[PDB]
């Protein structure tokens, strides 16, 4: 059940005193290196299109959506659990990375296969049933999450808003959908590349401008959820079921920390060692959490310390954009705009998560299926009624977890010495 | 302020049919999930259906005999109810849904009986 | 199913004085617990939402508490206007059920 979250976050724990609170300090370089120009070295595509490519898949409509269920059921503190699911899950994201070095590329051209699912293959033979039990979880969890959950989502969300889009939302995602991901992972990181920061810096600044409009509320906002959080006024510890569970539960849901499913977009990186690509993927946590997250949150507590009438019953995705539209003109329409790109990013992304995953069952001979399924289901998502569809999808991310982290927990010992070796090549 | 008002109720006899309606006013239909709760002459309160503006869930005591539809353009929801059984007697209460049954409408009432 | 029973099933307050109501459920279900108050001829009021959050325009002599596998209703210095049947509901999923129902009657 949930102890599996106990078990996640005991990583990010475990993983951050092992690594001796690394990702503080290397933090500034790994950004620096994220966005900077100019590198090829044996990789599909480059350090910049493999973030953007993860990024796509880590940022989605848990991000809109899902912090506001976490929002509601769990409290305004659930940010600051959130924030503690990406802080401590930096170490797990960047462990994922690292231990993809010891990644075979695939037939069919380079396209490059590296995931937890070849770790297991590398660890110290039962590790080939791990590998292929998450390649089995793994190739059915890209539905949920990646597909399913994010296609519904807008598909339901354009209707209220603009409602002239039963169906039609759904064909146009699914048409959008097979032109990305037809060319391969190379198309994915020309599309994801440019569509992913222009999707970013359109909301942040929304968020900011609502900052900026409500400058006063801003330092209170902090306070609730602050205040909240830690708040034990009932219940022994009783808030981990409320505030806490919330948090952790619909934190790892949106910047994906110890899921296994993150670094497999990192090895198509051209990087000369694992330390150099793994210093871009520990930065998928904190632009999906830290920043997006903490934008979304911010405004739905500042909607909650104003009064504003009738949200206080509206279920996600509803609710931010009905927050935005309080603070700001046009925010509704700007939410709901954003979900169908934070969305369709979500499913180019997942696309190439679930397809190397698959591959490793079948080989390169049913790529071709995984891709027409992936396009199919995302035009079935639209229309078909899943009410609960995040309830499924945490279930098998769940599933997907508990192999990777176990990984994890026994190879430890492989990257911190994989660690000592790029830290030495970081002082020429 | 906000408006709820079920319509539609009747007698009808076993296995029969018939929809309800949910004439809704002074909020936005479109942006609020919508529930439909029952109660039976003894004060059972049940849940029926649900619905948000594009998929929808049962209970399995009325699952394949209940469709719950809706029409944000005319700002009412309905329930669509076949195949009646003499359980299905109650007031049918229309509401909007989150975590808590805020809003309630007035309510309308089926008698299902030969 | 979650399954709720409430206890007592009908109590009789002696007006001015305090009462506590009882739901009690099946499962754990964290601080998701509401409580409704429904008079003759009328739709349920909604008293407390979330367990213990208050909800606008009740009177403050109404005060839930508890969590999992422990739900109490409190009123503090009973009226005559409290008369009614007092119901509680989840919301664990989205198959939200109801307690079988609490009657509240005056002493005279």
């Known amino acids: 059940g949930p102890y599996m979250l106990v078990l996640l976050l005991g990583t990010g724990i475990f993983l951050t005193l092992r690594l001796g609170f690394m990702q503080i300090h290397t933090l500034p370089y790994a950004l620096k290196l994220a966005f900077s120009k100019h590198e090829t070295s044996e990789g599909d595509i480059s350090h910049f299109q493999a973030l953007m490519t993860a990024l796509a898949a880590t940022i989605g409509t848990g991000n809109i959506a899902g912090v506001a269920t976490a929002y509601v059921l769990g409290g305004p503190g659930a940010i600051f659990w959130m924030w503690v699911t990406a802080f401590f899950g930096m170490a797990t994201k960047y462990a994922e990375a690292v231990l993809a070095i010891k990644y075979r590329t695939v037939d069919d051209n380079g396209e490059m296969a590296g995931g937890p699912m070849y770790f297991l293959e590398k660890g110290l033979p039962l590790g080939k049933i791990l590998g292929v039990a998450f390649a089995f979880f793994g190739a059915f969890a890209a539905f949920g999450i990646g597909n399913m959950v994010q296609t519904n989502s807008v598909a339901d969300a354009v209707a209220s808003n603009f409602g002239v889009d039963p169906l039609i939302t759904g064909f146009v995602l699914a048409i959008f959908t097979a032109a990305v991901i037809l060319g391969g992972i190379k198309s994915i990181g020309k599309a994801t590349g440019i569509i992913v920061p222009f999707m970013a810096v359109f909301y942040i600044l929304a968020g900011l401008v609502i900052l900026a409009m409500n400058i006063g509320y801003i330092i209170p906002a902090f306070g609730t959820i602050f205040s909240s959080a830690f708040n034990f006024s009932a219940g022994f510890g009783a808030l981990i079921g409320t505030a806490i569970m919330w948090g952790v539960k619909r934190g790892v849901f949106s910047n994906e920390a110890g899921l296994g499913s993150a670094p497999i977009a990192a090895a198509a990186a051209k990087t000369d060692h694992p330390g150099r690509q793994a210093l871009v993927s520990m930065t998928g946590t904190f632009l999906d959490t830290i920043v997006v997250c903490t934008i979304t949150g911010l405004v739905l507590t500042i909607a909650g310390l104003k009064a504003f009438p009738g949200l206080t019953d509206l279920t996600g995705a509803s609710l931010t954009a009905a927050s935005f539209d309080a603070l700001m003109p046009m925010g509704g329409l700007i939410v709901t705009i954003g979900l169908v790109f934070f969305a369709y990013s979500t499913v180019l992304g997942w696309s190439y998560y679930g397809e190397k995953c698959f591959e490793y069952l079948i080989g390169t001979k049913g790529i071709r299926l995984y891709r027409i399924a992936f396009v199919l289901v995302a035009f079935w998502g639209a229309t078909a009624s899943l009410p609960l569809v995040w309830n499924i999808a945490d279930t098998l991310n769940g599933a997907m977890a508990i192999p990777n982290l176990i990984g994890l927990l026994l190879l430890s010992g492989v990257v911190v010495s994989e660690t000592k070796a790029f830290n030495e090549i970081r002082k020429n | 302020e906000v408006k709820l008002e079920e319509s539609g109720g009747g007698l009808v006899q076993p296995g029969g049919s018939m929809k309800l309606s949910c004439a809704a006013s002074?909020?936005?239909?479109?942006?609020?999930?919508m529930d439909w709760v029952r109660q039976s002459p003894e004060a059972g309160l049940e849940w029926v259906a649900e619905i948000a503006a594009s998929e929808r869930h049962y209970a399995e005591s009325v699952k394949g005999r209940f469709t719950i539809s809706r029409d944000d353009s005319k700002s009412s929801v309905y329930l669509q109810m076949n195949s009646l059984r003499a359980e299905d007697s109650g007031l049918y209460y229309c509401?909007?849904?989150?975590?808590?049954?805020?809003?309630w409408g007035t309510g309308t009432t089926v008698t299902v009986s030969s | 199913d979650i399954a709720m029973t409430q206890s007592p099933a009908s109590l009789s307050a002696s007006v001015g004085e305090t009462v506590t109501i009882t739901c009690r459920t099946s499962?754990?279900?964290?601080?998701?617990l509401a409580w409704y108050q429904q008079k003759q001829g009328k739709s349920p009021q909604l008293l407390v939402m979330n367990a213990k959050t208050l909800a606008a325009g009740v009177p403050s002599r109404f005060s839930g508490s508890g969590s999992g596998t422990a739900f109490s209703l409190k009123i503090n210095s009973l009226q005559p206007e409290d008369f009614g049947s007092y119901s509680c509901?989840?919301?664990?999923?989205?198959?939200?059920?109801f307690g079988g129902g609490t009657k509240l009657e005056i002493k005279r």
């Open positions: 509901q989840h919301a664990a999923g989205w198959l939200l059920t």
């Open positions: 002074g909020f936005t239909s479109s942006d609020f999930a």
């Open positions: 509401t909007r849904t989150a975590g808590a049954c805020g809003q």
């Open positions: 499962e754990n279900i964290a601080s998701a």
